[PDB]
Amino acid sequence: VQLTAAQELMIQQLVAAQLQCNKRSFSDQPKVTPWPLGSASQQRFAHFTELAIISVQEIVDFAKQVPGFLQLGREDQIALLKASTIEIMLLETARRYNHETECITFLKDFTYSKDDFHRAGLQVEFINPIFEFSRAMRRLGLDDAEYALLIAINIFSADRPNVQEPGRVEALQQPYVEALLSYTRIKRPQDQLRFPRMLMKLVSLRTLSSVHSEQVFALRLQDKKLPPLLSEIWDKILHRLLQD
Amino acid sequence: EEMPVDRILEAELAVEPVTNICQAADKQLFTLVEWAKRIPHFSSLPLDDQVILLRAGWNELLIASFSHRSIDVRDGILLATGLHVHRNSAHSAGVGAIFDRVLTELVSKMRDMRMDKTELGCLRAIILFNPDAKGLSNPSEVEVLREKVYASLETYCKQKYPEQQGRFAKLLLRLPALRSIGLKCLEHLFFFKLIGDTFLMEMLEASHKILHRLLQ
Ligand SMILES: CC(C)[C@@H]1c2nn(-c3cccc(S(C)(=O)=O)c3)cc2CN1c1ncc(CO)c(C(F)(F)F)n1
Structure with missing residues (x-):
């Protein structure tokens, strides 16, 4: 029925924090190994890997600005980011999917199809679910506020491995769920299923997190090695990034 | 309603160490159909x-x-075989982490919410009507049924627990936790298959004699 001023202001802050974090990532564009125009393979893999890193950094800056997140202990902050990063990477990936070109756009003008993802070294078993999830999110027609809220909710999941203060995390999560209920019921009152449909994407994301482990398994099989940051996060650089 | 909660409640009521869990699972599969x-x-x-x-x-x-x-x-789960499994044994058998997650994320939460049987049946119906299950002839048809369950369950929650406005969401937010826990339990079941029951085994493979028969 209603959006409190507090709710409105919190949603505004999250949306502002995403935009601010996007700008930072875009500064880092000329830093990335260029997309080649057997070492073109190695170059495409390096390229993709670099975008993943920038995404992780972006996610960290974003969490730091989510009101509440900094009041948790540093080991819980880490445990929540370790678990949620791939999921948020997927959300942010879907968000950059264009259904007309069937391409995903990273940074400003790095446009990639399914085949591009294959040429970068990912396997079909991973790529297909990524694109199926992107299509599914496009059907939902989420706006920037909804995306930001769903990311906040996703970070504050009390069930992740090694959360020492889960009661605190659930309490942080609750207002963000409440705000998303209010926001979507005002945005589309005639569509009462929008809210649970969103929430259920959190379930999809647990599965996708698992498809990703299978991709990491395949990389070991192929003897492809990941940079430190990504090895750490997916099995104290994260620590450093938070400390800044 | 097109998906009445009454009929879902009827369905729950109409159904009332490492290997003990597997035995109980084989039986409960029959009930599940x-x-x-x-x-x-x-x-x-x-x-x-x-x-x-x-x-x-x-x-x-x-x-x-x-x-x-x-x-x-308290500190354990009750299998349908009547057998009770305690925390100590679960850790002895190297299955203690997942067991503690079940108690922390599922049992405990269901207790503190006083989750009722209708609420449960609706959650399970939602789990059942999974439009992302591979090889469905018509995913839309299944999505629509899931969505009817969303509508009936929200409605039921507003009518029966009007004092608790966030209750519908609290229910739905057990499902992510349940999905990840599902993935970890399946892991363990796959290990038992590789190391030391007919219907259960039929479920763990990719041919479905027992399931086909039982639904006719
Ligand atoms: C596709 C994704 C799962 C993930 C990813 N996410 N973003 C991303 C997401 C959002 C924004 C931005 S960007 C450039 O606008 O900042 C970039 C870019 C990428 C590439 N990628 C990826 N994921 C898993 C693995 C190993 O399993 C690998 C590896 F290591 F195989 F290459 N790469």
């Missing part, structure tokens, strides 16, 4: 799709059921 038949519109679906949904969901479906059954138990 009967439960699903009682769920509105499930048997209207094509037969191969009924089979697909039950292969995709049995694991989470059973875990949600024994979790709710174990609300009275």
